[PDB]
């Protein structure tokens, strides 16, 4: 019962991340405004979820099979495109980019990218590196390439408009993001909070 053995505990689950909010007309004036979501895919980044509550009780993690999911809360009459991709290198910050087309293109260039209208649903797969490197579970520290295994950027390609042609300006909510994940934790512990 007092075993000093370490082993990966690969356990599965699902979680609710947050509700997206298409930026609309007013709040959309430049490129960086078109970045709705910048959410690290570190296990311990989603506070109340089960994944993070578990992560708090280990040192390390590694997404063996993760996939962000979009579930719309709108009709099919509204119109706006969305692009989503998970950059496996956190320190790649597109916010510095001004040219919007350059932004969408460096997004599409990432392999796991996805484009979808905010009236249907699609899945954003996380692509896993090939070296077996484990990542630390605690809050982000001096460097990020240790903790974060990826970063989910959600983009607004077009402008938001309604049944009629008038474009909305009220910055409404379109859907919700879920995470159907499979992770492997290595070292039992407790992280400070």
């Amino acid at each position: 019962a007092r075993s000093d053995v370490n082993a990966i505990t690969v356990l599965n689950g699902s979680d609710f991340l947050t509700t997206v909010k298409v930026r609309g007309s007013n709040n959309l004036i430049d490129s960086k405004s078109r970045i709705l979501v910048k959410q690290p895919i570190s296990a311990s980044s989603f506070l109340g979820t089960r994944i993070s509550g578990l992560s708090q009780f280990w040192e390390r993690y590694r997404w063996h099979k993760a996939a962000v999911r979009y579930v719309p809360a709108v009709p099919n009459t509204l119109a706006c495109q969305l692009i989503g991709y998970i950059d496996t290198d956190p320190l790649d910050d597109p916010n510095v980019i001004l040219d919007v087309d350059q932004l969408l293109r460096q997004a599409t260039s990432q392999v796991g990218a996805r484009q979808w209208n905010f009236s249907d649903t699609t899945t954003i797969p996380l692509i896993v590196r090939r070296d077996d490197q484990l990542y630390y579970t605690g809050q982000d520290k001096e460097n990020v390439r240790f903790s974060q295994q990826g970063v989910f950027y959600l983009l607004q390609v077009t402008t938001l408009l309604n049944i009629s042609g008038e474009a909305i300006t009220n910055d409404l909510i379109s859907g919700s993001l879920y995470l159907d994940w499979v992770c492997g934790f290595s070292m039992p512990q407790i992280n400070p909070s």
């Binding site: 099919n76 009459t77 119109a79 484009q115 979808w116 009236s119 249907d120």
Partner: peptide
């Protein structure tokens, strides 16, 4: 007998909303 005098054809097509990609 005179065949195919005034032959008309019909082929219905749907027209959905929000063709998605």
């Amino acid at each position: 007998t005179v065949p195919n005098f005034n032959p008309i054809v019909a082929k219905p097509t749907v027209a959905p909303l929000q063709t998605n990609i």
